[PDB]
Amino acid sequence: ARVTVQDAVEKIGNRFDLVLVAARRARQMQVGGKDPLVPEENDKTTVIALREIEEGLINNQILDVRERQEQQEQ
């Protein structure tokens, strides 16, 4: 779990767009059709998305390109 989101905040620094990005990632991982890109340690989807953001592996641009690639595949 993440007691503080400062590490995730400095990756995409707005403290406001981070909430939207994490909400989108958590929605993807929760409603189905997605699997976590970071090892899952019994914690909920919110902190998984936050840790993916903090590790620098999830961002808005790459989320958009992944959605575009999924649309192109279908």
Partner 1 sequence: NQALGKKAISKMLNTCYRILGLKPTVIFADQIMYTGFAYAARSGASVGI
Partner 2 sequence: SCDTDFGVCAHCYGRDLARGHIINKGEAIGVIAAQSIGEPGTQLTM
Q: Is 14 near partner 1 (CB under 8 A)?
A: no
Distance CA 35, CA 11 (A): 22
With CB under 8 A, what is the number of residues at the site for partner 1?
4
- Interface residues toward partner 2, by CB under 8 A: 13-16
Q: Is 6 near partner 1 (CB under 8 A)?
A: yes
Query: Would you state the structure tokens that stand for residue 16, as one six-digit string?
Result: 């406001």
What DSSP character marks residue 4? Answer: -
Torsions phi, psi for 48 (to 5 deg): -65, -45
Measured from the CB atom, the residue of 17 and 64 that comes closer to partner 2 is 17
Measured from the CB atom, the residue of 10 and 70 that comes closer to partner 1 is 10
